[PDB]
């Protein structure tokens, strides 16, 4: 469990699609904006 924030270039969505193929699981959360993808 590790909070990694990304750009607003939408490479957080790329990171969802990419890191899932290697990392345990990523959790994309734009709570009040700010693409905070917490990967395990």
With left for phi above 0 and alpha for psi between -120 and 50, is residue 33 left, alpha or beta? left
Q: Which domain holds residue 4?
A: 1-40
> Can you read off the two tokens belonging to residue 34?
């700010």
Q: How far apart are CA 32 and CA 21, in angstroms?
A: 27
- Using an 8 Å Cβ cutoff, are 18 and 6 in contact? no
* Domain count of the fold of the chain: 1
Elucidated via: NMR
Other Cβ atoms closer than 10 A to 29: 13
Burial class (CB in 10 A: 0-12, 13-18, 19+), 33: exposed
């Amino acid at each position: 469990t590790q909070t990694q924030e990304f750009d607003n270039e939408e490479e957080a969505r790329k990171a969802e699609k990419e890191l899932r193929k290697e990392n345990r699981r990523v959790t994309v959360t734009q709570e009040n904006g700010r693409w905070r993808v917490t990967w395990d």
